[PDB]
From TrEMBL, chain A:
<feature type="domain" description="Acetyl-coenzyme A synthetase N-terminal">
    <location>
        <begin position="52"/>
        <end position="98"/>
    </location>
</feature>
<dbReference type="InterPro" id="IPR045851">
    <property type="entry name" value="AMP-bd_C_sf"/>
</dbReference>
<protein>
    <recommendedName>
        <fullName>Acetyl-coenzyme A synthetase</fullName>
        <ecNumber>6.2.1.1</ecNumber>
    </recommendedName>
</protein>
<keyword id="KW-0436">Ligase</keyword>
<dbReference type="GO" id="GO:0016208">
    <property type="term" value="F:AMP binding"/>
</dbReference>
<dbReference type="InterPro" id="IPR042099">
    <property type="entry name" value="ANL_N_sf"/>
</dbReference>
<dbReference type="GO" id="GO:0019427">
    <property type="term" value="P:acetyl-CoA biosynthetic process from acetate"/>
</dbReference>
<keyword id="KW-0547">Nucleotide-binding</keyword>
<feature type="domain" description="AMP-binding enzyme C-terminal">
    <location>
        <begin position="542"/>
        <end position="617"/>
    </location>
</feature>
<dbReference type="InterPro" id="IPR032387">
    <property type="entry name" value="ACAS_N"/>
</dbReference>
<dbReference type="InterPro" id="IPR020845">
    <property type="entry name" value="AMP-binding_CS"/>
</dbReference>
<keyword id="KW-0067">ATP-binding</keyword>
<feature type="domain" description="AMP-dependent synthetase/ligase">
    <location>
        <begin position="100"/>
        <end position="481"/>
    </location>
</feature>
<dbReference type="GO" id="GO:0005829">
    <property type="term" value="C:cytosol"/>
</dbReference>
<comment type="similarity">
    <text>Belongs to the ATP-dependent AMP-binding enzyme family.</text>
</comment>
<dbReference type="InterPro" id="IPR025110">
    <property type="entry name" value="AMP-bd_C"/>
</dbReference>
<dbReference type="GO" id="GO:0005524">
    <property type="term" value="F:ATP binding"/>
</dbReference>
Amino acid sequence: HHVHPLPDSVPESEDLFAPPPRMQGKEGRPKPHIGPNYESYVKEWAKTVGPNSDEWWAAKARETLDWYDDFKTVRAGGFEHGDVQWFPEGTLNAAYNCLDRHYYKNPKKTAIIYEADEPSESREVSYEELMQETCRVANVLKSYGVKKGDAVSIYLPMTWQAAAAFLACARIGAIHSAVFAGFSAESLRDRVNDCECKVLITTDEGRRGGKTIATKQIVDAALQQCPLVENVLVLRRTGNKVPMTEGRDKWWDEECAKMPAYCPCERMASEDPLFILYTPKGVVHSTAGYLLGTALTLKYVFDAHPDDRFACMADIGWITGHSYIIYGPLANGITTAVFESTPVYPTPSRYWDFVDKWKATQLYTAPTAIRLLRRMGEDHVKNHDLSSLRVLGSVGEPINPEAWHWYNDFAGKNQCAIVDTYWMTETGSISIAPLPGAISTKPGSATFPFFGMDVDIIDPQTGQVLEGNDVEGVLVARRPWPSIARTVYRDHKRYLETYMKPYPGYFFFGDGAARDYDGYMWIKGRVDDVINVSGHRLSTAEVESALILHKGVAETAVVGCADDLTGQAVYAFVTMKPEFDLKATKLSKELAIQVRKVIGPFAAPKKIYLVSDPKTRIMRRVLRKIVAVEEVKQK
Amino acid sequence: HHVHPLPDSVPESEDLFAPPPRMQGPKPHIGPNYESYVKEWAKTVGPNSDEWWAAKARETLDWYDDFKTVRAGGFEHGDVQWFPEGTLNAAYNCLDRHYYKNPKKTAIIYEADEPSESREVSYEELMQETCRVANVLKSYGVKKGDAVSIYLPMTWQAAAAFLACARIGAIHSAVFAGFSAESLRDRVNDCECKVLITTDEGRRGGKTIATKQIVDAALQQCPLVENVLVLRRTGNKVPMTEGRDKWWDEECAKMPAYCPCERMASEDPLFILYTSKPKGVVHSTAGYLLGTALTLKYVFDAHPDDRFACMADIGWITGHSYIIYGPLANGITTAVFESTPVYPTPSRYWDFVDKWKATQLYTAPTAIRLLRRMGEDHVKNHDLSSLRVLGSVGEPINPEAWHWYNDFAGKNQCAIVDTYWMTETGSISIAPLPGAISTKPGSATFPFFGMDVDIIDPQTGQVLEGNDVEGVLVARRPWPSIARTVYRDHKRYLETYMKPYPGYFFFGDGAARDYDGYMWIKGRVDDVINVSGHRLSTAEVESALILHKGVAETAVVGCADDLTGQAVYAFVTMKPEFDLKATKEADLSKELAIQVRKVIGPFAAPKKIYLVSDLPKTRSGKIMRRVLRKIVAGEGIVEEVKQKVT
Amino acid sequence: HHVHPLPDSVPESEDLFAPPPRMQGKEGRPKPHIGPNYESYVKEWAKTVGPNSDEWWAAKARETLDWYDDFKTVRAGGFEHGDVQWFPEGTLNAAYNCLDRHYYKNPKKTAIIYEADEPSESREVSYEELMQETCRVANVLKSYGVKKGDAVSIYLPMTWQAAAAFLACARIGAIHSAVFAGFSAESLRDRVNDCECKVLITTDEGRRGGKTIATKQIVDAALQQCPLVENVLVLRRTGNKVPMTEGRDKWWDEECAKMPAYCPCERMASEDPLFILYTSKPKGVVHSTAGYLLGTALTLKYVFDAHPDDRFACMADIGWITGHSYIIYGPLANGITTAVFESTPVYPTPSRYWDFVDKWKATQLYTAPTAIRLLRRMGEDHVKNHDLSSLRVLGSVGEPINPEAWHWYNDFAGKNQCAIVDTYWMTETGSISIAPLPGAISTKPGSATFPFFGMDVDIIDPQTGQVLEGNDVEGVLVARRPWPSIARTVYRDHKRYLETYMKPYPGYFFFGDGAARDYDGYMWIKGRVDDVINVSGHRLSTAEVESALILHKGVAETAVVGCADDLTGQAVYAFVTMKPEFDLKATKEADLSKELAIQVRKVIGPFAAPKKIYLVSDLPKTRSGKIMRRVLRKIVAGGDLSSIADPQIVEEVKQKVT
Ligand SMILES: Nc1ncnc2c1ncn2[C@@H]1O[C@H](COP(=O)(O)OC2CCCC2)[C@@H](O)[C@H]1O
Ligand SMILES: Nc1ncnc2c1ncn2[C@@H]1O[C@H](COP(=O)(O)OC2CCCC2)[C@@H](O)[C@H]1O
Ligand SMILES: Nc1ncnc2c1ncn2[C@@H]1O[C@H](COP(=O)(O)OC2CCCC2)[C@@H](O)[C@H]1O
């Protein structure tokens, strides 16, 4: 075999996990939407791609969403000029599909499980309460003069009103631009100024991990260089005294108290911008295509059912919260989780106390969280029930098989489907993932593309498609899909240069990928992070997976630098578990052998640096420029 | 019987008036008896009433986009929804669709202050003038949702201003012509409107209203008003501020006579109407329009060729609903009466009916008591057979005035519909259907479609089930035309109507349901007087006083008394003919107190009676009892009362 | 016969031209939509007029355009108060019907044949390319804050992006106000200020006939007195260095490169204004959306017998209404190919039109009598040796086509195998009002023939105001009822709208033209009523006399006007241009003026002979092509000259008359 799966301590033949009992409609669990085998996935997937897929997408579009005006055309446009259209003649409102229609059917159903930073302060937020709070905010924005198409920045932590802020903008046709509450005043400034918003929504302070986020302090600093912000809505989250600029700044509760608890929905066109999410690339998503994509993926990738309680542990400052905390779940009318704390506050058992308390049916987090909890021991999880869960999802980066097994062993008790969901902020929704009721998973493989995704592997040098299996290269998409980002706000040139120009005719994700002998897709990491040693292209996940196979390795990050013998050299930055006593033990040799043993001599790191902890909310570009979190520069 | 009807000189058994011949079978919409009213009413309330309202909504109004949901929300948080997904335009349903069917049909009977200047305004003429004004507003930058203040007298173009705002999706805020510069100021500043429509001068009762003069004074303290449209009503020279002020006729001559209709959502605000801080009551589009359309059709048994005469002003909700939106929504002829009931003489109302053959008349007890005060010579020698229904609104109509209305104006051949409602209800809430309900003088009778009201004991706070009960009036469920909020003050909206009795809407009136199920509105809860644990209503005492020969108008209030808790103080106005020099003032006040003792009881006898020439009232006609209460309590037409009491 | 056709050298009996074979569905040409005879035109026309025509218009409205929301009422309003309504409850978007729906069907089909001033720089613009550029400009306009209902002035030459600028404004619901590229800074200034636009679209420089149009220079001068214009979008047409005002002025390409290539369509109501077109105070003619779009679509389809694969070539400019209706909206609404001709008829040579036809296989041609008379003045070498068989229909617009020029058109341009459609209408009619349907009507040189669908026209005595029933009658032209494409107002001046067209003859629309209906029912437009000359109580029309003069060998173009005469009331004065080869030295001018005056006396009558004739090199004309007779009238007797093409001619005329 030319394509090698990610290094795992378990042999290959023992590493195929079929849909487990809970995903078979047994043990009181509902029937999956797609099952029972791979063939059932292909039967349905084949309808969503190719020349006869307008019928399927038109039906799913009209069955999944409530429309004000029906659409005539299904799709149009393409990558070349960035004019992708989906259901253009149709009109709808995202807030209507995520709130109103569910409020009209069951007003008392819980929409949001607000898991506060402190476990006792948690509570359920019904669709009625959330709709009221959203219409109040919408009415406040309209009183500030926010019109259809105006940008509104959101700088809110993971409190339940953050969904009301999002949907308040969507309800009136405003483009919300969410900014993670941990971002600095300098980062916020850049995003508030780029979107040219005139209104900003934020908190007095945020609460995460028992520590205070000085949000209103961070806003006041940024706004000194944001001349366009005239109105700032401040939610009273902590109540601590914060500066309030008279005239500009108003309190959420006081403003909403003046407005009615209903607000009419603006009739939006499918291609009206729904939100900007800065990554700075202000990635722009439309309404219908994005909403439909997030709705379908949640239903099928997480096998969501009406009475399910979906728990996505991301932040609404990232696309994961946009798609799989707010728009996706609420569009399907189920319960979604707004988790305000960290995975290790008050203790590393928080995720599991949370599931058992609410009987969560699915969990969705990142490899960074999984590897963190793995470094903290199985005592915080071994003594839990967790039988409510049926599907466990991972997103953000390649999940090392060791973490995948840790995930499957303890969190799922070997009875949950593990969905490795690959996608980007620009894809809008999950692009490659196993349907839990049909796909047998391989640790660290996103498996097969989702409905509407037709992806190929291309040789980056020649630009030629590699037909068949056992191939490796860069990942691309053949055709647009509904939830694809439509542009980069006021920088369409950068939108085309980044995703459409490198390989004309396709969408360029920026990831190296490989399709193994069985057809499973393997995402190996960013193309920029690849290392070419003696003409052999090493992927970042391949080497890092081997290092964590060594007992005591907690997290790694390999980067390259030009070597005067091999072209490029592998340099490693390794974090050890807290128990590995580096005073008694002199290790860097045992790790390099681990690479030489599992990968090959060419992959052996030329130098290894043992470090205590750069990451986002892993910055390998930082590690590259250093060799070419100040401890890294010192070590 | 525990619940007592309003004192009447006619004994009870002789005081039930069945639907008279004119309201008998062409055919009324609901008839011929009470059961015919209940069979239909039952469809409009309860858990199975969506079918009826969905049908009525789609049959009564033209929609751009149909609605999916019928109703949602409730009182608790003030999120009432009706037909939310639907879209429509008020101007389209009041003008366009009728212009398309019969453009030459008369929409407005403009009865000018001088009878000779009257004329008919067709739907074509009204629609053109409405599109012209709408085109002017759009040229000023008025967008959907922007507030526009209207300060116009009772000239027919006032309907054009209303519907012009509704046509483009602007929220008009009408202010009664004659309010001071200060009252206007507060309403213009609260709604934050950037455009104001008014006249050069108004004409009412042979007197000139200096509207533009009052506007210029107010705008000195209204910084947001950039454009003022001035209608040339009299032509007398008035100041015009360059840039800000433009002439109605000159502006409209630049614009086309058609304007596209803004596609409004059911719950988009239609107008703000401030009540005498100033409470800006807000009404939506679909629910309000439907309510005013249905009530007009069923409460006044309106048919296509009728000529509806509501003698109110467009500055009050009565003019909003039953001069403009209600009648014109049904596509009939409506009256814009610019004069007073007594100009040139007290025969004006009746000269008006016979001139135009009015089929219904709608006015207030304050006007009825006025004509009663002016003698029956001005009405006895008129025909008035065109009328089928006579309506009363604003406050309880004493049975003494009810009979005068019934005897002379209707010649005992018209149904008398006592219509109870408020600005916040949008449309008539309790009233007898004239083709089905037998009336009692001073009784609103039974609730309208969509209104399910109960009596609640204010002490216990519990609903009193059954008949022969008395308490405070409340509604069980929202209805389409209910006000949606108070402009930029939703808290005051909830605290005033929804929080006092959670789960219900609190009107603010004491009411009683007699042994037959008839509802009796006895006056404001604030006006109730607690004498030794007995709650006296203002209607009970004032009705007894006007029964005494010579009494023109009365108003009783309460004040802190030691032995009985509160004491009843009376302010009585005598007819101008009453020789108060020949009769002793003490002898008269004694006969009045005994009159109260005879029909109500000893506890109701006024501790002191004050003979005054006139009582302080608002411009809508309501009597200002709060003022009389604070004056008697020593907490300093108002200079005469404070001086006489001393 | 009382009504006389325009003087023609061909006798009458030899002057009836039936639909030729190319218009009969033979030779493989498509079948006409209406044919084959007059009875077939009236059969369909009668459905479009009177009180029983709502069914037809509702069906055509729903068959011709894609609607977001359907309409309930078909028509309402009238002339009296200027409240004309058509399909009011309906909603649609012009850009959607001219671009989107055609992009969705065949994105690679050519929408615009861009014939640049230089033939080599020409190319085809697909519906995909035009839609993308239109959505980009719309997105730029939205980024400038342009809202539904805002005016946007366009000062663009005849480059294909002018269609993108138009449709970008319509796409977002903006009212574009086009001004012909070449108007002075003063004419532009007055039009930018009247529409109160805050955005202006223009080029750095224009190119027409090998000459440079200093568009940005004229814009910079005009905007010095236009305080409301905050943003100027400048298209890079030539690339020559032009002044750019920092902040205000931005480059089309740089701005569009920042925006996506798709933009949602604004849902416009039928009666929302689509554009303002000022005519030479400035008269801002306003057109609505649905009715205008329907009219331009139907007229193009039926007056030019347009079929899906046709290549329509309207040689006008988007600065006047002919380009609005029969370069952009009409053709693109039908989803066919249209031509953006940037040059002149004689650049590089007078063979350009014909090089153009054979180059692109144009299926129809649409130009003005001034262009036809120009090419006739330049000799048959430039046209005789061309194929031109792609053509099936040849159109004339702007003024009466003299029978002499009509024959030249029919003989050389059509090689006696094309239908000649003389299309009468005004900027205020929106679309062609009177014209022969080429597959059904047999034509007479210089006759607009019969009214188009929705047009019911009468002849009225201008003095008595009475309708002249029947045939062989003469008077002034009026319309009985509103039609879909009729102008709805004059921008912010509805008073001038009513006083000009609705008040003169209450109950009708007053075109301002003298007309006559001959014994056969054919309509004859005789010229402006203002241009009529009263000689001894005889009402002379400008078309009959000018047609008579051009019958004289050597005459290129003429223009007669009226003047105060002390004996006959008014006297006929003539301005005649001879072909360049005509030796005015060998032939005596006084002898020519005698032969011309006799030519007029022989065909018309003694009263029609010009009292004085002036030989001039050219005439004062506008860019639309109609001769400015008011200028010649006021000069002869001893003010709205914005469209004056060559102001130099007025100085030669003022010298040659004094
Ligand atoms: N399952 C996965 N397996 C391997 N790589 C993965 C996987 N999910 C994400 N990635 C990497 O994340 C980038 C995009 O991240 P971003 O769009 O910034 O954040 C978004 C990403 C999804 C939610 C937050 C991809 O281009 C990849 O490199
Ligand atoms: N038929 C009636 N019988 C007894 N009382 C009545 C009756 N009609 C009104 N009222 C009192 O008027 C208030 C409302 O006043 P307002 O807000 O001006 O509403 C407008 C609505 C029409 C004119 C007043 C009620 O709440 C009552 O107190
Ligand atoms: N076929 C024709 N036969 C005789 N006269 C005609 C003909 N077409 C136009 N006209 C005269 O042009 C005026 C309108 O000019 P304009 O407003 O520019 O409209 C534009 C619309 C087309 C180009 C001019 C008419 O009122 C007439 O006088």
